[PDB]
Amino acid sequence: IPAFHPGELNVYSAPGDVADVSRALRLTGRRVMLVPTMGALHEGHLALVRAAKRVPGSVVVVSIFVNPMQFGAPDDDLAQLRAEGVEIAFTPTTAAMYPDGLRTTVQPGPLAAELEGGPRPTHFAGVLTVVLKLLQIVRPDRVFFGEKDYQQLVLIRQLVADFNLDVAVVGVPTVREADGLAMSSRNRYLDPAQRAAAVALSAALTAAAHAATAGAQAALDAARAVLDAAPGVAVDYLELRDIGLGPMPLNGSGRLLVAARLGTTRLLDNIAIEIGT
Amino acid sequence: IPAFHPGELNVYSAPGDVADVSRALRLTGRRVMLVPTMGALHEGHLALVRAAKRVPGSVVVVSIFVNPMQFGAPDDDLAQLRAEGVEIAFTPTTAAMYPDGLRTTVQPGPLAAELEGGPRPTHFAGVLTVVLKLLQIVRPDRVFFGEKDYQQLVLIRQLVADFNLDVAVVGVPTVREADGLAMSSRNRYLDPAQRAAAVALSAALTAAAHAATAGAQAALDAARAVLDAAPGVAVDYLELRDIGLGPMPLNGSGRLLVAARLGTTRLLDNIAIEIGT
Numbered sequence: 316i317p318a319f320h321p322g323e324l325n326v327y328s329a330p331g332d333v334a335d336v337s338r339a340l341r342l343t344g345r346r347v348m349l350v351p352t353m354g355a356l357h358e359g360h361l362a363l364v365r366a367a368k369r370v371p372g373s374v375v376v377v378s379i380f381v382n383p384m385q386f387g388a389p390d391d392d393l394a395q396l397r398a399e400g401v402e403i404a405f406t407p408t409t410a411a412m413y414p415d416g417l418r419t420t421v422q423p424g425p426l427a428a429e430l431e432g433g434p435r436p437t438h439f440a441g442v443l444t445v446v447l448k449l450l451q452i453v454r455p456d457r458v459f460f461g462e463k464d465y466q467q468l469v470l471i472r473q474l475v476a477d478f479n480l481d482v483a484v485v486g487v488p489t490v491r492e493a494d495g496l497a498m499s500s501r502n503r504y505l506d507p508a509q510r511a512a513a514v515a516l517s518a519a520l521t522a523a524a525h526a527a528t529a530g531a532q533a534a535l536d537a538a539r540a541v542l543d544a545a546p547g548v549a550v551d552y553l554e555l556r557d558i559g560l561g562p563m564p565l566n567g568s569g570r571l572l573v574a575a576r577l578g579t580t581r582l583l584d585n586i587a588i589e590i591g592t
Numbered sequence: 593i594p595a596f597h598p599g600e601l602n603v604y605s606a607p608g609d610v611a612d613v614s615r616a617l618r619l620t621g622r623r624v625m626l627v628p629t630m631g632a633l634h635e636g637h638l639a640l641v642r643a644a645k646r647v648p649g650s651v652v653v654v655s656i657f658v659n660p661m662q663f664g665a666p667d668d669d670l671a672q673l674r675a676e677g678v679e680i681a682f683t684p685t686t687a688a689m690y691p692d693g694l695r696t697t698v699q700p701g702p703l704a705a706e707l708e709g710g711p712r713p714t715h716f717a718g719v720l721t722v723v724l725k726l727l728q729i730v731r732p733d734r735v736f737f738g739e740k741d742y743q744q745l746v747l748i749r750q751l752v753a754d755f756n757l758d759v760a761v762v763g764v765p766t767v768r769e770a771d772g773l774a775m776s777s778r779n780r781y782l783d784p785a786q787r788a789a790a791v792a793l794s795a796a797l798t799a800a801a802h803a804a805t806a807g808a809q810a811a812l813d814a815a816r817a818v819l820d821a822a823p824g825v826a827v828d829y830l831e832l833r834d835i836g837l838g839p840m841p842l843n844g845s846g847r848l849l850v851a852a853r854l855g856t857t858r859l860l861d862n863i864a865i866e867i868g869t
């Protein structure tokens with residue numbers, strides 16, 4: 316077995332090493348928690364880590380991996396994890412994840428072609444493939460995903476249900492700046508004027524959530540009005556759906572999702588909506 | 593937890609029941625073995641069961657399931673398993689396996705379009721989807737497949753490697769009638785003259801295996817000659833490949849695969865070949 320030093324950060328890049336260490340740790344009764352990331356860590360990611368660490372005795376495994384895009388489509392990350400009490404960082408190369416190339420893959424259901432999948436019809440196949448691999452390597456009791464990527468979260472629940480995966484999927488609420496802006500690595504691409512304008516997405520959604528006492532159309536129209544008031548924001552979609560991303564029912568709980576471009580940067584956000592309250 | 597009676601046959605149809613029972617049993621140190629089948633059991637299947645039972649202390653789980661075919665594409669089974677000392681039979685309905693329909697699925701690599709996949713280009717996606725689900729439900733230490741379906745075996749090894757599955761894949765040699773005919777549920781469709789003619793497939797392959805001291809072309813030509821001598825046998829393919837079903841190399845180990853029709857029944861068989869011996 317690879318060396319593992321409890322109560323310290325241990326970094327592995329070979330899938331077999333993490334699989335061996337995780338197996339040994341689980342046999343001692345320590346539950347294993349998995350937090351998938353693409354690195355470039357910020358407080359939103361740290362919320363997922365802290366949620367994992369709340370589970371007593373947990374070994375928190377944070378993976379850092381950027382999946383290659385399919386056809387036609389020095390940092391302080393480890394220091395941050397060390398300071399959070401993370402004991403395993405898994406940092407595989409593309410070659411380690413795909414030693415035989417892109418061969419067997421996961422084909423998501425039709426939700427993957429909607430919303431974020433409109434612009435990127437192969438994106439969620441890639442996400443679900445990588446998540447499935449991470450789940451099998453680490454064999455966590457629970458895996459943590461942010462509500463900010465709500466469609467991703469829903470698709471991961473579909474993956475887990477459809478393939479009978481013995482893992483609990485935990486959605487963690489979106490961590491926001493003081494003005495409401497959803498934290499995201501991509502926010503670093505925004506210049507100061509764009510960062511100021513970007514508050515429109517959260518302002519729109521929160522407006523809608525409160526407008527919703529007057530019904531679904533009022534909610535949608537309120538959000539659209541806020542977005543239309545922000546000149547440098549080009550909306551890609553603004554959609555109200557049920558909580559599983561099916562059609563919104565006449566009365567009940569739903570989710571309002573928005574994606575918009577500010578210059579070259581595409582931002583996304585979403586919020587709970589209640590109708591027929 | 594559902595009741596489990598050790599040392600007796602226990603039958604479950606709900607995935608959750610088997611998952612709960614398997615988990616509990618594994619915690620006691622009993623290793624769990626999985627033998628996937630479509631029922632209609634015969635001595636070929638029993639070879640896989642007996643291979644699983646050789647592992648001391650094993651809980652052998654035999655699943656019986658016929659997967660629905662994708663678009664455009666009273667028995668004594670349980671008594672037989674009971675007599676073999678199988679403790680778990682898993683007999684799910686289609687609805688239990690696919691409660692949300694065919695949604696997330698496995699997309700095999702390009703080998704799935706070759707050989708058996710020529711006639712049935714969606715067949716192995718179905719096989720790999722069902723096997724992945726069974727593996728996740730049961731979480732066996734080892735899973736057993738027959739060499740008779742050699743391409744299936746190779747694709748299952750690809751599934752396990754590509755998705756980082758923590759299971760050992762065990763291939764069990766083909767069980768044959770006294771004359772050589774590979775046992776198969778479909779043999780029951782053969783009339784007596786067809787059953788007699790069907791010996792040609794194994795005769796061809798065994799001839800080839802011995803001809804192979806004189807090289808690959810001699811092996812192929814010997815097999816073709818045997819098949820051409822059997823009038824009621826219509827060959828679909830006869831292919832020599834490396835052991836991973838890539839191109840046969842100039843000197844080394846390979847596999848010769850045949851598929852042929854006798855009336856309305858398609859039979860398959862394959863054998864190890866050594867060249868450059």
Ligand SMILES: Nc1ncnc2c1ncn2[C@@H]1O[C@H](COP(=O)(O)OP(=O)(O)OP(=O)(O)O)[C@@H](O)[C@H]1O
Nearest residue numbers: 352353359460461464488489490497498499500501
């Ligand atoms: N503000 C946030 N609140 C809660 N979870 C978040 C937040 N930002 C990211 N996450 C979650 O962290 C996980 C890793 O996401 P990822 O590494 O893509 O970070 P990201 O901030 O979304 O980066 P990018 O902007 O490049 O897409 C995902 O589950 C994501 O939903």
Ligand SMILES: Nc1ncnc2c1ncn2[C@@H]1O[C@H](COP(=O)(O)OP(=O)(O)OP(=O)(O)O)[C@@H](O)[C@H]1O
Nearest residue numbers: 629630636737738741765766767774775776777778
């Ligand atoms: N003669 C045999 N020897 C070894 N393994 C076998 C034999 N026949 C079937 N198996 C294995 O049993 C498992 C279940 O196969 P399945 O239930 O399809 O039976 P089958 O005999 O191949 O039926 P069918 O003829 O309808 O395809 C597979 O792993 C298969 O390779």
Ligand SMILES: [Mg+2]
Nearest residue numbers: 356390391392
């Ligand atoms: Mg950093």
Ligand SMILES: [Mg+2]
Nearest residue numbers: 353464499500
């Ligand atoms: Mg992201």
Ligand SMILES: [Mg+2]
Nearest residue numbers: 633667668669
């Ligand atoms: Mg029977």
Ligand SMILES: [Mg+2]
Nearest residue numbers: 630741776777
């Ligand atoms: Mg078969």
